[PDB]
Structure formats: C-alpha cells, structure tokens
Short mmCIF file of C-alpha atoms in Angstrom, two decimals:
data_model
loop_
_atom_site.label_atom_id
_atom_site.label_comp_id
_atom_site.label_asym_id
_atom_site.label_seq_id
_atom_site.Cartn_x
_atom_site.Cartn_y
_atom_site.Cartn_z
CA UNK A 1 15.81 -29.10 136.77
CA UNK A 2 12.70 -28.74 134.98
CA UNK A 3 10.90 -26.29 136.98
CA UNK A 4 10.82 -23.26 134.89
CA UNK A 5 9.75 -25.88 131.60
CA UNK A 6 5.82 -25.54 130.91
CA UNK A 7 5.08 -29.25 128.81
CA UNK A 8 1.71 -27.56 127.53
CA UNK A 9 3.75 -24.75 125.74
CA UNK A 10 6.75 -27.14 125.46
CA UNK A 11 4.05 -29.57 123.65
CA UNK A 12 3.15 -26.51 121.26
CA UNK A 13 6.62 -25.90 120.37
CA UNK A 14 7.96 -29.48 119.26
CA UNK A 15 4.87 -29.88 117.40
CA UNK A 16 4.97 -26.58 115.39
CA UNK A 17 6.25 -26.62 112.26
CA UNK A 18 9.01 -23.67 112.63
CA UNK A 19 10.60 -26.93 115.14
CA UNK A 20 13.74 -27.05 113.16
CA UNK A 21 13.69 -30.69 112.06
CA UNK A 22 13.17 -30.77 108.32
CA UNK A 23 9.55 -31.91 106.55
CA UNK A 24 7.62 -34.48 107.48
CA UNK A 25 7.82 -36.93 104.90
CA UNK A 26 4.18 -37.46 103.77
CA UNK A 27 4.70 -35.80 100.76
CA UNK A 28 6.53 -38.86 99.13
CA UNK A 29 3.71 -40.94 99.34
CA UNK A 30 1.27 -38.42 97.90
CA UNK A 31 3.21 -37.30 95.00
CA UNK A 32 1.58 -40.87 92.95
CA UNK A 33 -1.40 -40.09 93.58
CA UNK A 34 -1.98 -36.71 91.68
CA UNK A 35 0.24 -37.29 88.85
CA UNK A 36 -1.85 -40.86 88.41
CA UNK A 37 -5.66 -38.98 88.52
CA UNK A 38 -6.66 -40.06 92.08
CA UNK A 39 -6.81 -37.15 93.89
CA UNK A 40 -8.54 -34.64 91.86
CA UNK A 41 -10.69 -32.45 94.44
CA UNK A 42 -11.77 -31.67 97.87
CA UNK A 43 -13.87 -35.29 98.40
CA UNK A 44 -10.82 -37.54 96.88
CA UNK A 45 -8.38 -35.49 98.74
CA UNK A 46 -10.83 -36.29 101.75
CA UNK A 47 -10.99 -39.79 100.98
CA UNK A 48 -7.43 -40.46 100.55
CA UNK A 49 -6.40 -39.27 103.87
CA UNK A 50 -8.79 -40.63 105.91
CA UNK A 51 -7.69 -44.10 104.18
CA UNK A 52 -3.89 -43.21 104.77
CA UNK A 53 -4.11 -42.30 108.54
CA UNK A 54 -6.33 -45.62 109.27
CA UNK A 55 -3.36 -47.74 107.22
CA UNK A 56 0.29 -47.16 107.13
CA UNK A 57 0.44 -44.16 109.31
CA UNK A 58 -1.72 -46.03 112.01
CA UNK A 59 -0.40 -49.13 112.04
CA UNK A 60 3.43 -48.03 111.87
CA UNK A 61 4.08 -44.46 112.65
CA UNK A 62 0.94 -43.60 115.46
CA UNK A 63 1.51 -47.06 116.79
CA UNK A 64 5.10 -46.70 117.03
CA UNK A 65 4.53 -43.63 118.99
CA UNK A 66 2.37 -45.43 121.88
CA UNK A 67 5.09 -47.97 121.82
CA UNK A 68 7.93 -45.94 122.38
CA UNK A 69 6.03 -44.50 125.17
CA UNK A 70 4.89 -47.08 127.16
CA UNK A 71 8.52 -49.02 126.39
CA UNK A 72 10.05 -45.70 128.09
CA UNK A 73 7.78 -45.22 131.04
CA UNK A 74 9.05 -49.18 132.14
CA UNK A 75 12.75 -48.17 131.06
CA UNK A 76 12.53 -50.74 128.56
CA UNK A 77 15.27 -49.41 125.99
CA UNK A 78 15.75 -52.71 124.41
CA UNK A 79 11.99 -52.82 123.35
CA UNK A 80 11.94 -49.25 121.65
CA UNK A 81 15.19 -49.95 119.98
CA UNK A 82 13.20 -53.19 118.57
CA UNK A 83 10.11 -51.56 117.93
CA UNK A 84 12.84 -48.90 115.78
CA UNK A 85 14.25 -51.87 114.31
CA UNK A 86 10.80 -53.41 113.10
CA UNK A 87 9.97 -50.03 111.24
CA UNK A 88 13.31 -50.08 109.71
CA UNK A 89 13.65 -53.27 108.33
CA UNK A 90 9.79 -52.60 106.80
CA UNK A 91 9.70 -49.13 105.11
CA UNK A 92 10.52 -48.71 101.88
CA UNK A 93 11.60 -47.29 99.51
CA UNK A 94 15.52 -46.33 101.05
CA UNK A 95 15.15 -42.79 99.99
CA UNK A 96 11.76 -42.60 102.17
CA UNK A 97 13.84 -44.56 104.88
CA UNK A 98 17.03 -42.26 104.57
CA UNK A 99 14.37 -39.33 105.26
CA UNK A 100 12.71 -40.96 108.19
CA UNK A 101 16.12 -41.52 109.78
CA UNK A 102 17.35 -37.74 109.11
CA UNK A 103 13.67 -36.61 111.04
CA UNK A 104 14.40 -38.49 113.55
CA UNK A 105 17.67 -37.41 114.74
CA UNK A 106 17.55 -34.33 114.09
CA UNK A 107 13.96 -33.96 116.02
CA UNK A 108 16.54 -35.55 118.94
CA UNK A 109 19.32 -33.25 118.76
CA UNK A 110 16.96 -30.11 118.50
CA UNK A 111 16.09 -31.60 121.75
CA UNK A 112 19.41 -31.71 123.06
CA UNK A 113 20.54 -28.32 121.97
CA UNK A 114 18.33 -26.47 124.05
CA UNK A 115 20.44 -27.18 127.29
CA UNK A 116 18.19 -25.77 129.74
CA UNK A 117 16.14 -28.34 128.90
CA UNK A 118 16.44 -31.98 131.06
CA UNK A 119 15.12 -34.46 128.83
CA UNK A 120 16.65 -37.59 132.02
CA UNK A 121 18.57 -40.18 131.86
CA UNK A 122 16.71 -42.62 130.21
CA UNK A 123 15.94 -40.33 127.23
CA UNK A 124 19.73 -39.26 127.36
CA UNK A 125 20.36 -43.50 126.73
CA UNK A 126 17.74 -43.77 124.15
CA UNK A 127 19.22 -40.96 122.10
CA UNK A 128 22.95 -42.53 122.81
CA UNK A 129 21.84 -45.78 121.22
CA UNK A 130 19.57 -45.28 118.92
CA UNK A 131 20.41 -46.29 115.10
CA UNK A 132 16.90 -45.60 113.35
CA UNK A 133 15.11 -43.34 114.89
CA UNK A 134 11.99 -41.78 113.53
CA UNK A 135 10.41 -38.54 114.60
CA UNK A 136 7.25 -40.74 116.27
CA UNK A 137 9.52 -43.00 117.94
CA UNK A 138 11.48 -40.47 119.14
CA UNK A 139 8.74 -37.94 119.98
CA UNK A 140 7.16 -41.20 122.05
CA UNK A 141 10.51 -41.29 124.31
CA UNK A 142 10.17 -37.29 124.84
CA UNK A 143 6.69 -37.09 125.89
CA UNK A 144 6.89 -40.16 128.36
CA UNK A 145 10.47 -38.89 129.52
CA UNK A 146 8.75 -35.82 130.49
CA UNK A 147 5.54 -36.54 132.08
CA UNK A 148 3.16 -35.62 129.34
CA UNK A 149 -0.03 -37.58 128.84
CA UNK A 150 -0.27 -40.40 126.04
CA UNK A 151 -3.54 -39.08 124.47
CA UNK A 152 -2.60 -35.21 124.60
CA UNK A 153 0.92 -36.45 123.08
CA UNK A 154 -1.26 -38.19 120.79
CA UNK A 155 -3.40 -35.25 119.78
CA UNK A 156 -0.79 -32.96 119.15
CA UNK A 157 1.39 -34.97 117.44
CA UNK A 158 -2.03 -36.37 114.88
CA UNK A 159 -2.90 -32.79 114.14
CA UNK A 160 0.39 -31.40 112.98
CA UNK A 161 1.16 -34.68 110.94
CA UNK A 162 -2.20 -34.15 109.54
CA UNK A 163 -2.01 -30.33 108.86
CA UNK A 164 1.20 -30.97 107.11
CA UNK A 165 -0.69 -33.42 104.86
CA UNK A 166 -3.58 -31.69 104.01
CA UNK A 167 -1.42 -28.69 103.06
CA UNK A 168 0.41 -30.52 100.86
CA UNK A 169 -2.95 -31.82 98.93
CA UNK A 170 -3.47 -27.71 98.73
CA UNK A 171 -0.49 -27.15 96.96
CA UNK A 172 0.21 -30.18 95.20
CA UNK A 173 -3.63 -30.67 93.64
CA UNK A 174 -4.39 -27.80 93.87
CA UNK A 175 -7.01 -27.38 96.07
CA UNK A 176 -8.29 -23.84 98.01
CA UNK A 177 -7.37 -22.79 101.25
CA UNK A 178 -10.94 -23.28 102.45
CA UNK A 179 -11.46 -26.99 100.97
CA UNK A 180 -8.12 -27.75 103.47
CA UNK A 181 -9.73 -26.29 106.07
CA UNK A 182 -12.83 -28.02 105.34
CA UNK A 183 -11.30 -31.06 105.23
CA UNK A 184 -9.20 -30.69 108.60
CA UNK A 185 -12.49 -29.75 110.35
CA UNK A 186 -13.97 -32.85 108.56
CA UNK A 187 -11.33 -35.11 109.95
CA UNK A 188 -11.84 -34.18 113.52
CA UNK A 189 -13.77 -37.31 114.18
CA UNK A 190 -11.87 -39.94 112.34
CA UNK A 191 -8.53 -38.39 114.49
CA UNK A 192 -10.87 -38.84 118.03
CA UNK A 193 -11.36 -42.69 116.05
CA UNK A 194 -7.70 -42.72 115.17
CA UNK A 195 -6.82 -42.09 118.78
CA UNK A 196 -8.56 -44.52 120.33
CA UNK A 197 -7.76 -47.05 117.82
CA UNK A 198 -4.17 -46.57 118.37
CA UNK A 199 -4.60 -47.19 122.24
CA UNK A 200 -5.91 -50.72 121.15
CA UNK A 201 -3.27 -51.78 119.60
CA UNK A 202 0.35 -53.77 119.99
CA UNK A 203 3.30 -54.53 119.02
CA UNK A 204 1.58 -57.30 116.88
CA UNK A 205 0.19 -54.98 114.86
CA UNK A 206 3.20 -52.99 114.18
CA UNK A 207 3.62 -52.22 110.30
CA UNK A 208 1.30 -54.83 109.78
CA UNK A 209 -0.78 -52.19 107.32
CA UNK B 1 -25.17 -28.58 115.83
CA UNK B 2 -21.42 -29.04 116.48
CA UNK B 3 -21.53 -32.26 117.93
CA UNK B 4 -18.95 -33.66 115.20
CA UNK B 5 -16.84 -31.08 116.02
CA UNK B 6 -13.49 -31.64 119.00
CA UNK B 7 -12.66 -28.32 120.19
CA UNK B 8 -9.17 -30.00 120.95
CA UNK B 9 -8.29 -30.17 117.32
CA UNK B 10 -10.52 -27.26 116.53
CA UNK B 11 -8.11 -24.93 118.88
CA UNK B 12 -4.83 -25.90 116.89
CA UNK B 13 -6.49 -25.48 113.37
CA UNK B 14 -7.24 -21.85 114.13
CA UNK B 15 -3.70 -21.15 115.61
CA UNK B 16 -1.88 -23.09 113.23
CA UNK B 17 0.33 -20.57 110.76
CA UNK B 18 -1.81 -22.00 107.54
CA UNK B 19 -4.61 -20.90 109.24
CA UNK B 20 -5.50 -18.69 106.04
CA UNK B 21 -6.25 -15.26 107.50
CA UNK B 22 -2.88 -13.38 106.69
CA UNK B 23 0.53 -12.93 108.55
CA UNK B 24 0.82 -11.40 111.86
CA UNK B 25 1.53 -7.78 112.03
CA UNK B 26 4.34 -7.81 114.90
CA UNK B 27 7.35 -7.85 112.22
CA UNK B 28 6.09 -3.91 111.89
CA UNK B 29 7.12 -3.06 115.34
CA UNK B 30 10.31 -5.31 115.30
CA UNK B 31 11.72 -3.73 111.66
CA UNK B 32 13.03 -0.15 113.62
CA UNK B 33 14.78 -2.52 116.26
CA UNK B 34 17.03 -4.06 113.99
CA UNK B 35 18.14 -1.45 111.65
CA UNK B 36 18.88 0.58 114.53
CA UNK B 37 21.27 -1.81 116.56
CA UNK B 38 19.00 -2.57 119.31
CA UNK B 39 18.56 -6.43 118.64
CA UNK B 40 21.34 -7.84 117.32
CA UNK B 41 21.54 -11.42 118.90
CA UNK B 42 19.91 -13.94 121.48
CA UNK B 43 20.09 -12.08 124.34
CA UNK B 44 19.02 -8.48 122.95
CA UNK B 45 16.05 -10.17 120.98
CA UNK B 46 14.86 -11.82 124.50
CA UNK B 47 14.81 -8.58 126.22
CA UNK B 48 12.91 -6.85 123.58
CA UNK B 49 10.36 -9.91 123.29
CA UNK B 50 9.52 -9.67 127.07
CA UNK B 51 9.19 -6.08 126.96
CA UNK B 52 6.85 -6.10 123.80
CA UNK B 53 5.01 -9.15 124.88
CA UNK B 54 4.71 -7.12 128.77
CA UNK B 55 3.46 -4.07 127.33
CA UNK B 56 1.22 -3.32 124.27
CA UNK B 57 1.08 -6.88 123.19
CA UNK B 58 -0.59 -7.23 127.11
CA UNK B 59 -2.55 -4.07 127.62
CA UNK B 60 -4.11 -4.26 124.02
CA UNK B 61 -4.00 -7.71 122.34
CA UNK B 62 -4.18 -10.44 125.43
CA UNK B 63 -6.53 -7.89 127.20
CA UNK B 64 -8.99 -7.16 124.43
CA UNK B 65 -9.02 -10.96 123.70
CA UNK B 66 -10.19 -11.37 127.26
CA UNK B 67 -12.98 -8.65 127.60
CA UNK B 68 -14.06 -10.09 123.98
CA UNK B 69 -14.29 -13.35 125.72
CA UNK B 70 -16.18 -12.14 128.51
CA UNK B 71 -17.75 -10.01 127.32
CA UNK B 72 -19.21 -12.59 124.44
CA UNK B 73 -20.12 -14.96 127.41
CA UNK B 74 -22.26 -12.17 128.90
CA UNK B 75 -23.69 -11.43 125.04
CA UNK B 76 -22.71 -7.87 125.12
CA UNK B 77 -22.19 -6.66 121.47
CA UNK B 78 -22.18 -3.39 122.75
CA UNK B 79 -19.52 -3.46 125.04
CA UNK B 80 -17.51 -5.95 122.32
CA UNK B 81 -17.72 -3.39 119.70
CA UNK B 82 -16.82 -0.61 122.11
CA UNK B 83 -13.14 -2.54 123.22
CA UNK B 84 -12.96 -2.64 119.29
CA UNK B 85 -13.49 1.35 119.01
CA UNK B 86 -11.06 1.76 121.62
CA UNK B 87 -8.20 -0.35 120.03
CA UNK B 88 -9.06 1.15 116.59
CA UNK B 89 -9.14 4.98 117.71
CA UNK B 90 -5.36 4.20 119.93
CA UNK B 91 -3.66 1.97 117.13
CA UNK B 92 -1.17 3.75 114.85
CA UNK B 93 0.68 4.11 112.01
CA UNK B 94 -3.02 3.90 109.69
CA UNK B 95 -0.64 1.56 107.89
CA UNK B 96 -0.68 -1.04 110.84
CA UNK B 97 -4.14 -0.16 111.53
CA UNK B 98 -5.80 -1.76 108.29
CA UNK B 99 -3.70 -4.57 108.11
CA UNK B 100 -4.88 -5.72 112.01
CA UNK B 101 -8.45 -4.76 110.57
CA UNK B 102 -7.54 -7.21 107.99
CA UNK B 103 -6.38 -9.87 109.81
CA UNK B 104 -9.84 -9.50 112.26
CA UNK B 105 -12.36 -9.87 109.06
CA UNK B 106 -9.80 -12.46 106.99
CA UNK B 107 -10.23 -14.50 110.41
CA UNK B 108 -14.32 -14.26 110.80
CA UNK B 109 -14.60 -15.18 107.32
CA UNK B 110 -12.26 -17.63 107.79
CA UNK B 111 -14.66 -19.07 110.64
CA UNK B 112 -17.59 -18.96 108.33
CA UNK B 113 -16.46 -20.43 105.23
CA UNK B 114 -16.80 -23.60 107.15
CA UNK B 115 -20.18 -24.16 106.76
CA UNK B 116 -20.33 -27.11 108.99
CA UNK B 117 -18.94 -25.27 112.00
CA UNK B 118 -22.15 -23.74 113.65
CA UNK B 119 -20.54 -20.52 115.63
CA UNK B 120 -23.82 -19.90 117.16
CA UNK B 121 -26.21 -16.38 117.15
CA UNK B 122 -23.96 -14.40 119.31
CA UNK B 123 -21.02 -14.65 117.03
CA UNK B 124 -23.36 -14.45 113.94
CA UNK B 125 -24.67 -11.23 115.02
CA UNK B 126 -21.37 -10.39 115.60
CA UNK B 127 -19.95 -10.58 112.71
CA UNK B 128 -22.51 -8.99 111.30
CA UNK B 129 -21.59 -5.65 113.21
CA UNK B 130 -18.15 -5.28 113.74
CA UNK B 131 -16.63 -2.36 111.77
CA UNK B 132 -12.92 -2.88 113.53
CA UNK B 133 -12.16 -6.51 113.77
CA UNK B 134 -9.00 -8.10 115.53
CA UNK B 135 -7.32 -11.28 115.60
CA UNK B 136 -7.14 -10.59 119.13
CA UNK B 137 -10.59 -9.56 119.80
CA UNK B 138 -12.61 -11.76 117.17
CA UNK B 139 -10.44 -14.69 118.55
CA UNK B 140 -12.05 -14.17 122.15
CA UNK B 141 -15.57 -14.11 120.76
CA UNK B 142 -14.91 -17.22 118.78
CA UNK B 143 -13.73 -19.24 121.88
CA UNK B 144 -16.08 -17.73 124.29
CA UNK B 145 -18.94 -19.26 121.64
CA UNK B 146 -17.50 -22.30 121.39
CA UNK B 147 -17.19 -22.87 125.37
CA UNK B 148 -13.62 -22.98 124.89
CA UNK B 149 -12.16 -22.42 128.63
CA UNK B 150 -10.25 -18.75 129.30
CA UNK B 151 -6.72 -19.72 129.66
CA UNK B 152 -6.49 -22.45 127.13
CA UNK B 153 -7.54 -20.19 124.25
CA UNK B 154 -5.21 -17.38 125.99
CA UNK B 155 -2.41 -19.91 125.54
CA UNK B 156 -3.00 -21.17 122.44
CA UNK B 157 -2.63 -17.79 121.04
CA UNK B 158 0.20 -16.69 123.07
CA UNK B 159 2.25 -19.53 121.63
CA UNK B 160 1.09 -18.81 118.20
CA UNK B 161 2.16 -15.20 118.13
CA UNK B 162 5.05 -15.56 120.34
CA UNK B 163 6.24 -18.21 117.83
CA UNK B 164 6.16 -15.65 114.99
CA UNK B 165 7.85 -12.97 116.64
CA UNK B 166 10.55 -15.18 117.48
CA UNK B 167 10.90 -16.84 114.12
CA UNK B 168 10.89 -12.68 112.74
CA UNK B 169 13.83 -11.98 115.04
CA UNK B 170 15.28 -15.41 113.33
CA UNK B 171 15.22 -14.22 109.96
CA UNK B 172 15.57 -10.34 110.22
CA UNK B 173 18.25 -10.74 112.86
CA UNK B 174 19.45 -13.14 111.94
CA UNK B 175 19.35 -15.36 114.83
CA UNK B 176 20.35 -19.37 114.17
CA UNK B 177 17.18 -21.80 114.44
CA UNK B 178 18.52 -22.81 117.73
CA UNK B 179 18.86 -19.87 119.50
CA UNK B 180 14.76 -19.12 117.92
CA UNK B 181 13.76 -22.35 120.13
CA UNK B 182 16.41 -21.79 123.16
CA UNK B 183 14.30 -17.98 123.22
CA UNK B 184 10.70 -20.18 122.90
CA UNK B 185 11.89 -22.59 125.85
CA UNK B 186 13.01 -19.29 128.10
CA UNK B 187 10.03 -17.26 127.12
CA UNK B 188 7.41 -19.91 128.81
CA UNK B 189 7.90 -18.69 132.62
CA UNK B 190 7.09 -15.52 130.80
CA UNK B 191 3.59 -16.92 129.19
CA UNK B 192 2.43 -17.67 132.33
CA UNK B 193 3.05 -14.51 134.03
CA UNK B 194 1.48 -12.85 131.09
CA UNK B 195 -1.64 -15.07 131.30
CA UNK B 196 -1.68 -14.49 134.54
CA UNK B 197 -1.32 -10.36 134.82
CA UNK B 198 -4.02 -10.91 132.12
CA UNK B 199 -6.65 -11.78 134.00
CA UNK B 200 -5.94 -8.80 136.34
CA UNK B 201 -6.23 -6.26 134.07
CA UNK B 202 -10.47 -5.03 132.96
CA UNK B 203 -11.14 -1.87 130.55
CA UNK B 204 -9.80 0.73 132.71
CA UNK B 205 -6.18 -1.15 131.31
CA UNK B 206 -7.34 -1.36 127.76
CA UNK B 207 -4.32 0.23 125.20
CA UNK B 208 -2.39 1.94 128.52
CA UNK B 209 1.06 0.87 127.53
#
C-alpha cells in the first residue's frame, strides 16, 4: 500500500515545522528562565540547553521515543500505553500536560488524514487506544510502524525539537540570528552524545530526571 | 578542522526555514496563478507544482545545484562562476533577479558567520568571486566541500523548497493544512523522478525550460 511513500522525504515532512500539529511545548519551560536573569546571552543560552536536553527531555521525552519504538516493533501495545501512562502521571504542571496531550493527538490524526498513507494495523490500535499520547510517543509508534531506522528517527526528531528551542532563546532573550546558529552548530556533538545515551537507556530510567 | 562537526545535523540546519538567509522566491511565480483562476484548489495546485518543479525549477535550480556540486568537486571556479553567468543573464523580471542574488550572498555569509565551521579553500575562494550567487548554486558548492553525497543534499533541498511552495499555495489559495501535506505525501514519487532526470541533464540543459 505503501509503495509510492518515500520514509526519507516522509521523515522530512513530519518533522518540519509547517506539520500541522501546534508548537512544541519547550517554550513553557524557558519562559522562567529569562524573566529570572539566567539566560542572558549566547554562552547561558548555550549552557541551558545543553543541561535541558541531557535532563528532562532525555530522560522522559527522547527516552519515551526509543520506548515506544521498540514496544511497537514486538506489538507490545500494553507497554507503550504504560510507558504513556508513566509520563502522564509525572509531568507537571496540567497546563504543560493539557499541551502535551493536544501535540500528541493531533501529530496522530495529521497522520491519519492523509489517507493514502498506511500507517498498519498495529499503529491503527495504538492510535484507537491511546489516552495520553505525546508527540515522542507517538512519533516512536510511526517510525517503527513504518520501517524507519531508530537512530535516523532519532536524529530527525532531536534536531527539530532542538531548532524549535534555540529559536525560541532568539526571540525570547533576545539573541541574533547568528548566535542561534552558532549555538545549533555547537550542539552537534552533545546531540551525537544525546543519541547514544538514549540507546542506553530503559524503562527504569523513564522520567527519572 | 571540522571534526566536531555531523554533517547529519549540519544538512537540516541549512535547510531548515530559520535558516537566516531570506524567504524563497517561488511565491513570485505562483502570485499570477492565483489571481487568474488557474489554481484554485488541491488538485489545480498539484498540477501546477509538478509542472513548475519539472521545468524551470529542474533545468535551472536542481541542475545548477548539480554542476555547482561537480563542478566544486573538480575545483573549477571558472566553470562555477560561468553556470552562475548563465542563470543570471536568462533570469527575469530584474525584480526576481536581485532577490535570488540575495538569497545566494545572505546564504554564503550565512555559512561564514560560523566561524567554527571550516568550509575549506575551494569555497573560500569562492566566495570570494562570485558576482551572481544562488541558493541553488552556492548550496552545491557548500555540500560538494563538505563531502556531503549528491543525492542527499539534492533531497534535502527539494523538500525544503517544495515545502514552501506548497505551504504558498496554502495561504494564497487558500488550501486547508491538510490538503498542503496530502500534496507533500503525493509530490514524493515526483522528488525522485526529479532527482533522478537531474542527474541526466549537464550544461547543454542549463535554463532550457
């Protein structure tokens, strides 16, 4: 059914941010940071994202992303729907949550509109039952439902969180255009350490940042 | 030099839309189509996409981006600049002219204002000649420098222009958000046969549409 669907423009697409899903919500956590004199210029903006991917959005959202993945290539709905569950019951505060949840479906029913697309049956069941979803969780099901590699899935996914974050330092510090670019092209190594990090860890770590 | 640098990441940074060289220029060609009937929903903006993308989007912008490349790999400034003469003496109105000139030097700079992103002599040299920049045709000497492979950098920037001619058709159309990605998810058989006719075509094909 797939035939005519390219997954390395397919990965492009989901990941760009015209994908009609809403923001990512990495602005909420941000917003304390400038009003409260922490991140001031290019080297504290530097500094606080390289401390935010290696903590919360390591140890819940990337993570959750590997799990949802591996849970869907054994068929394992009951695991992602716990995993889901975990992240849930740990994020805080309900506005942020309320967000998470809206990203999350809608990044599933964007999905689903485009009919000529076969996401398979067990991503059809995941999106049936699901009651949290977030947009890694999800995105997790849809990369192993179609074939595409964990660490490209990875990648792609990293990067446009990450863009989306160091855009809003840009904006929100302010900061120039170049110091963002600067500092994406600075964080190329800690995502390759990011990366491989993630592939160490387990369910035991989930949310445990 | 570059050895903290991923090429991975380094190829969606540059074809990301924050990228900050400018907007695209195809919402020039794409204004008469509208105002004149022509496109007027999904199906009418599809067929115009594949016959702009199949025509001077192929013979001049893909192409040029490809004898850049190769040209770059051979370290042929001469023949670089000439493809650049070519495009610059064919392109019209003067209007659209300058602001593709634009785009080609806001991108170089772009390149260079990351000071710890070593684009080599070749592209140093260059930049330090061109008089009629391109996205298009600095974009191939940029990859070819970087030993980015052919087709990958030919996708990445497929996707990232196709993407904003379809989001233009979404706005000035207007088209919903779904139908943008349902168009995005048709248009990838397309890609390929583009990418593929592209590495058919040499000089002799250069601005013949």
């Amino acid at each position: 059914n797939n035939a005519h669907v390219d997954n390395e423009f397919l990965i492009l697409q989901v990941n760009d941010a015209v994908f009609p899903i809403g923001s990512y919500t990495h602005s909420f956590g941000l917003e304390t940071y400038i009003q409260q004199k922490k991140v001031t210029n290019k080297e504290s903006a530097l500094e606080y994202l390289k401390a935010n991917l290696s903590s919360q959005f390591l140890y819940t959202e990337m993570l959750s992303l590997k799990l949802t993945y591996e849970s869907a290539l054994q068929q394992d709905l009951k695991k992602i729907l716990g995993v889901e569950e975990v992240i849930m019951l740990s994020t805080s505060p309900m506005e942020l949550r309320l967000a998470n949840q809206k990203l999350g479906n809608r990044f599933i029913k964007t999905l689903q509109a485009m009919n000529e697309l076969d996401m398979g049956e067990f991503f059809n069941a995941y999106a049936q039952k699901t009651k949290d979803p977030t947009h890694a969780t999800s995105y997790g099901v849809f990369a192993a439902s179609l074939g595409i590699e964990l660490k490209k899935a990875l990648r792609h996914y990293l990067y446009a969180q990450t863009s989306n974050m160091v855009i809003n330092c840009v904006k929100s510090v302010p900061l120039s255009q170049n110091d963002g670019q600067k500092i994406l092209l600075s964080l190329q190594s800690p995502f390759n350490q990011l990366i491989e990090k993630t592939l160490e860890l387990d369910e035991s770590h989930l949310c445990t940042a």
